[PDB]
């Protein structure tokens, strides 16, 4: 059915993104 959307997938994926870019920012502000 076109009446069912893999909501749980892009979520678990938008939070990976929210995990990746933030620690790259934890990487950038700590230049040693």
């Amino acid at each position: 059915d076109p009446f069912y959307y893999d909501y749980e997938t892009v979520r678990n994926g938008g939070l990976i993104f929210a995990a990746l870019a933030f620690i790259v920012g934890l990487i950038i502000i700590l230049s040693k």
């Binding site: 059915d1 076109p2 009446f3 069912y4 959307y5």
Partner: protein, 287 residues
């Protein structure tokens, strides 16, 4: 006091025409873009298909007198006490008269008994404007079932039509003959979609109501020969089924509550949305 300046309007009127002509050239470009963008995004909307519909998954059971808060409160005496609710039913069914439905080029006379689904090809435009199944005021006995016996509309005893939301394409599946507790309903589970109402939900209930259901050829639900829906553009002046429930033995000067659920695999219920899969009305026939 800077509004007026020696031969110059407000803020440097002298270069007035510059600033403005820039704000006329810029915004009209800002507009000639955005509209390019929107006109693009309208070229991608499929002409006959909505791209996303998942958010209408469990359709819902509505009423004709879309009251203020699902409460029909009126005096069987006062003509105006009920004019609201009734004019609503009058207008609601204004589009439904057999003579409004005359020309046969876009209309088609279907079985007078609940039939199988009327697949008319595919949802595309290859075919021409598809025909709409008709609907005659009869199938609703008493409550708006012809001129005879219903001048008032509920004036005496209350009654109300329940309706299924239109959902494009929905092939409603009724529960199988192995009915997972579907209360009193007759063995016409093959070609219909039933409903049944209750005073309260799942505990002790102020049970006060004798119900009588009017349907096509006399069943309690939704015929299968009208679905699925194919859309306005494909199907204009299409008429979806209506179904009526009437409350006869009702306490007048008391208010009770009524829940009307609809059953099947293709239907769901939501705790946060009481109008998804079921239906609710309070009533009070005060006099």
């Amino acid at each position: 006091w800077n509004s007026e300046k020696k031969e110059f309007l407000g803020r440097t009127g002298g270069s007035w025409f510059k600033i403005l002509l820039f704000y006329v050239i810029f915004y009209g470009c800002l507009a000639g873009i955005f509209i390019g963008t929107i006109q693009v995004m309208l070229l991608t909307i499929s002409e006959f298909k909505p791209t996303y519909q998942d958010r209408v998954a469990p359709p819902g059971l509505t009423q004709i007198p879309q009251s203020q808060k699902t409460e029909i409160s009126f005096r069987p005496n006062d003509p105006q006490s009920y004019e609201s609710y009734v004019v609503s039913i009058v207008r609601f069914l204004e589009k439904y008269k057999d003579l409004a439905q005359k020309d046969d080029m876009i209309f088609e006379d279907c079985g007078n008994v609940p039939s199988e689904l009327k697949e008319r090809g595919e949802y595309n435009n290859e075919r021409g404007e598809r025909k709409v199944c008709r609907f005659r005021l009869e199938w609703l006995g008493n409550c708006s079932g012809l001129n005879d016996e219903t001048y008032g509309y509920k004036d005496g005893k209350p009654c109300v039509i329940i309706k299924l939301n239109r959902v494009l394409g929905f092939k409603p599946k009724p529960p199988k003959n192995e009915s997972l507790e579907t209360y009193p309903v007759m063995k016409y589970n093959p070609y219909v979609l039933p409903v049944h109402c209750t005073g309260k939900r799942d505990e002790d209930k102020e049970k006060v109501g004798t119900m009588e259901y009017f349907g096509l050829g006399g069943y309690p639900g939704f015929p299968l020969q009208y679905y699925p829906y194919y859309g306005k553009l494909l199907q204009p002046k299409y008429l979806q089924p209506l179904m009526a429930v009437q409350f006869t033995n009702l306490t007048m000067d008391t208010e009770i509550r009524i829940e009307c659920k609809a059953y099947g695999e293709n239907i769901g219920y939501s705790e946060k949305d009481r109008f998804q899969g079921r239906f609710d009305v309070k009533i009070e026939v005060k006099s």
